Design a protein around this nucleic acid. Sequence first.
DNA 1: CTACCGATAAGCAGATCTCTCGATTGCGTATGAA
DNA 2: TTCATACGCCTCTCTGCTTATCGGTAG
RNA 3: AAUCGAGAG
Lengths: 71, 192, 72, 265, 57, 743, 127
Amino acid sequence: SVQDQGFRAPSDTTFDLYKFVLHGENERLEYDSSSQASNQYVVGLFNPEKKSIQLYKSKSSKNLRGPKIKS
Amino acid sequence: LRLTAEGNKWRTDILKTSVDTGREAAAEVTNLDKDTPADDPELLKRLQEILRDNNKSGILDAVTSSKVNAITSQVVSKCVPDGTMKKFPCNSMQAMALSGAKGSNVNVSQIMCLLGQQALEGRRVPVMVSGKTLPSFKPYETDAMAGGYVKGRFYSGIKPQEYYFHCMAGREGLIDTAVKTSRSGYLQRCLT
Amino acid sequence: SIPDGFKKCKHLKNFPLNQQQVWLIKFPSNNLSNMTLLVPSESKESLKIASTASVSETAKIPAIDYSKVRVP
Amino acid sequence: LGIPRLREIVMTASAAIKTPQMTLPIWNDVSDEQADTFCKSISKVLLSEVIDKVIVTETTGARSYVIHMRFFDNNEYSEEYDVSKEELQNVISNQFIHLLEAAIVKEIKKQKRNNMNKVQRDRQSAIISHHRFITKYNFDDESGKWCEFKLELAADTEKLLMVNIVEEICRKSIIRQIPHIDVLVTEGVNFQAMWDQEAFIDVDGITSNDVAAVLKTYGVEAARNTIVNEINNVFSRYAISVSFRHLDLIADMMTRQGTYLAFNR
Amino acid sequence: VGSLIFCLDCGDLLENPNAVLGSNVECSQCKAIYPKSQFSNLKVVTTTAFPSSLRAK
Amino acid sequence: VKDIGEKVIFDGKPGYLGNKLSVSVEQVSIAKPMSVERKVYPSESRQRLTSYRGKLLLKLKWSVNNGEENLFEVRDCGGLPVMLQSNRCHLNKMSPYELVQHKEESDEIGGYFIVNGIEKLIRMLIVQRRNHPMAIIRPSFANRGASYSHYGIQIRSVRPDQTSQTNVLHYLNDGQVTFRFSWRKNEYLVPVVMILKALCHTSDREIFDGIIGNDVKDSFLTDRLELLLRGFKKRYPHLQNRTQVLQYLGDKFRVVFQASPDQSDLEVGQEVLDRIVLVHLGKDGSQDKFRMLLFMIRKLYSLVAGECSPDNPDATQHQEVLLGGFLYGMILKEKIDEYLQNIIAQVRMDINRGMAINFKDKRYMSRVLMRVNENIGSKMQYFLSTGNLVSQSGLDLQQVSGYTVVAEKINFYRFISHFRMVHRGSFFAQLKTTTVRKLLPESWGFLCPVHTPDGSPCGLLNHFAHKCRISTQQSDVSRIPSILYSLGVAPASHTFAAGPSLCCVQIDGKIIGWVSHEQGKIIADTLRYWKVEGKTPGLPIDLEIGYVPPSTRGQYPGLYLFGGHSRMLRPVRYLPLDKEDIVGPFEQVYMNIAVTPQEIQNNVHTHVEFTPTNILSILANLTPFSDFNQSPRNMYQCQMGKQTMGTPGVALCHRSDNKLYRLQTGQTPIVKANLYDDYGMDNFPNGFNAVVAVISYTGYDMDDAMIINKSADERGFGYGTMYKTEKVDLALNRNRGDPITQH
Amino acid sequence: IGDESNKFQELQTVSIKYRIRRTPQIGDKFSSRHGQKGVCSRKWPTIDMPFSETGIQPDIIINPHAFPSRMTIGMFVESLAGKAGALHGIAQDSTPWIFNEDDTPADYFGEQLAKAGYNYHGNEPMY
DNA sequence: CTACCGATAAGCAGATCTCTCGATTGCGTATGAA
DNA sequence: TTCATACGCCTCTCTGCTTATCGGTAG
RNA sequence: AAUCGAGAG
Ligand SMILES: [Zn+2]
């Protein structure tokens, strides 16, 4: 069965898929052109009963800027 | 320059005893067992450390140089002049060697019997960072020939590795002579 | 902040869970882990992403023919 | 050797110590068992030479520096180097800690730009009186296993290497070395106070003969016997063997004036 | 971890614990300041050039 | 010329200031002949005793502002001295018969440039590698200043136009690491963490993971890194924002990079960290530039802790030769950039004083260009003639005077030897250390063990072995990462893991993967399989791949790949397939080559260089029975052969030169070595077969003298002749407008 | 030589070539292909030159004392192979590492000289 | 109190055979008669 | 405004003797 | 007349 579509914090991110690639957004932070075939990561959720398997594939205070030119 | 058949047999039978010269030198320097296979991982580790540190590298070079020089002296004494097909009164080469007109017993020895070991300064031969003397040798090889021991002679030619080592030794000698050609005349000019 | 458009995950994919490992592959026809939001997206059927709670090709060319290349 | 030594010895009259080396045969009165014992006693011995490993535990806690250094085996290093356990304790308590924690305080200032029986406490008295107010403790069973002196600078808990300085510290430390002293041959260049009681191993006949120290006190016309001896000892390597008449005709170096002129400006 | 468990919000190190209280600010303001005294201390045990009597081969 | 830059000056028209100039360069063209247009073949300016120069076509831009008024113009600059048998020469692809027709040698080849009728040549130089950071323990680093250590990583990066740029990482004893570089003729140093934070919007914990990966239980590395981070934080508290640090860099370097007044500090900082650091990664690769330094730093701390051995700068593992053409292009680009700077300076002077400016008038452009120098070709000719390199950047070289040799043709042997000599450096020549002159084993198969002049330059003017090739072309490295990801690796961004414990994988300086050492060896072997086997769209055969296995106190581990653009190459048989394989110096050291098929052991060999004579110079191979002589005597022979009374050539009818030394007769060697004919040396025979007698008869020869038979001389045993030409003229004192009264 | 520009004028530019004949006098350095360089000591008259059974008078004389110091066996091997080649008419190849000790070049060329009827060691009797 | 000079880390001048050839000779800018 | 010609500006080796800080004692 | 390059002893 195959289907196709240190850090921690409470849920704040999202998905964009401009087209895969996103940019993401949240109220705390402000969030790939290689590995053409290595991109194929899948997530395994195998059920160990007999053989069953599953498959599926900051700026909050960073805006300070100095002068364009210093005399 | 030629030798008799029995002389060549002597030379070969003595050289073939030098197979384990380097292996025994390594076993003694590493304080391992006397009869230790050259592929022992412990021996390889010890040789790696010896290559890493210059003092132990020099110690191993001195020991192996001593052993191979003993072998070379044995060969020369056994062969010359009891192996040459032409004897002293008629042998022009040996005659102008003994009479001292030109050359030396060392030159005759390395022409007819054995070059021996090529000594780079007080050391056998520089080693690549991988414990590999030449691209043609196993890493951490315990062969004297791999360590610069030329088993050939100027009469029968030398293998490419021996030629490379001999070129290195000749280059070292030429460098030293070029440096010391005009070392100091200032001392003499000041004294006078 | 659209780079070149937002075709988001409005068609959410449900991969429910209550024994899980990544099984990266190269190209067969069917904790630095900041990509663990693909299976758990929202679990609430909402347009958002929420946090959770031999590949090498051998191709050997071995067994050099010593009897053929080691000519006396 | 060679032209280097020749130029250093006659072109400039180098009073600067280049490499004079000690030397001593046997006396025919003292066996070889006592031989080299005098050499190791007189040889320069540094504290680093008996250091096995150094352990530093920088606890922020207000701070801590538990330098639990480790030495070699007691009897082993005592036999190799005739340095007593008590002598090592004395030098550590006196010179090492004081001077080198003073160096630590200097680098700090630059940066700002078991059981005891009260004998150990009596030991700790002066060591605490030391500047950095450390808390030292030492060995009891004659073995070097515990030489921990807990520093405690402040609550600043500044990040310091604390081992990179300690290595240079142990290199600086000297256990028992007489000045200018580094075949049973030792190394060193000294004449004054080298006149030890000539009774250990041929201590009567010992000479690091070189113009570095001989001409200063141990004779003056002895130049006409040291210069010639050394310059001949050079050519004695390759056995060129120039006539002694020339090595004594070279006397404008000494007799043309008071002491040890040179063939230069 | 190494010498400070960084703020779980950002990826920038805080200041040393020797502060007034709960110094968890200067990482783009960190948009969060969790309190202090949650960490006992920091100890970095390290070890050691003494080649004179070293003999092992 | 595209990447030269965008030199800009501003008009004084009353925050605005005026109008820009945005002078650029579009293309550079070819012009071989000389005029009504006629071709001009070589041997011209040989008979004339002048230069064989081409013509340099140059097109520039005059964009008064961003895409409003562009005034393209072809602005040819002098005459480039072109190279014979090259693209810019009429004798590019000619038949030998056609060459004979065009007054040329029956088989003529040469990279020499004909200037003033002297036929000089750019000597090869050998330098550090391209995209490999090596470790150096020179004491000069410590002597740079207080608290400086001997350690320090060095990488000599090269832009896609083969422009060098050094980036040294000195290590200070206090515990901070200082990045070092150089711009113009001077040096400018900056803290490392500054550049690390400026390259990407990345945090410190990420830097912690980059420098230390799963080595948290280490103490030395962690404490040093924490010291570095705290030092940066206390030194620059205000510099929090990435844009803020970019602006800090821009203001710190404004007259350093000759930045235009109309340039934001963020723009200037981005420009400098795009142009001067890790230049071999190019633009938009900052994400990998940040990834490279994290690798470079970890090696430095490994060097400090001694986990990695240093790398010899003069060892051929990390040596690399830049060709004559590459230096020609580099100096040409420097001169073009200087020319643009000069027109900018002229506009500046006119603004200062002339006050007659339009910035949009073709007549004004003509006035500007008529007042600057268009003698780019003339100055290139001067460079070829003298060897005195003059530039602002300095090309990250080390010599100043001497790059062109006269390239004499006393003998054909000497003439062909001119094109195979590689020079270490005149600075090294002045150096008096012996260890640089050693014959390292790592030079097996690349430099001739024998061919080396005896005397002062001994041990320096090495010669390449015959059958050794220099890849003067970037290989198709695009698809290499893709097939590399096909094997078992991990992307350089998905997971963080550094240190020697993991086999780093990089292609020409791009960190792309990390993997265990066993898997790294497996990958290296499989890549060898696929490279020699062919039948793969990527992986050119001339791919220098080097896998350094994990070593106890050895060299720093990690797999390496090198597409390269000037790296040394050497053919060799490959045992598992018995097909030709190419190996480079860095690659060779860990490869178990066998000098003969006879000596191939079991499991201790994968390659065998067929024709063991190949590890030798051409002249060295020309020596008969080199395996029976003494190495000093072989070197004497090599030096003597270039001094022979040679056969310069057959075109000597019109080859007006200072000296020729033509031998009238000549014979093939009865004992000629093989490959004497294979190299066509027979077309240039020299010497004669003599009936020698090893005999002490006359007594007039004891040390080295010899006696010739008087009659044999009278028969004409050897009759070499001297051809000498000199120039006679009366216009040496004549000026342009004053015809001389004497003729 | 004419001016590159259209400077017709009167052609005040000429290049001439000198031919110099260099017959080998005494003291002119000859050499072999083994570094055995030397000078022409004296043009020995042909009659006084030693001759052989075949009547050939050697042209180049070198002193045997050079070899023990120089140690150039290549000169000897070249002499041997050169005689063999000049006799049989064939061309002799001299490529390093083609003669193993069991395939000594001395023996290889001595076989050819013997089959040609000359001295096996190359020692030609002379007067 | 204090004058003088002998214990102590650092700036200036100076250094390292004979012969033959060949080649080459930085770069820049202002006044005044017309 | 220019032309003719006198004028017109900038990276791998070490001694021996300049001199330093610094205090200590009879006056 | 000086500087650089090639050398040779
Ligand atoms: Zn934070």
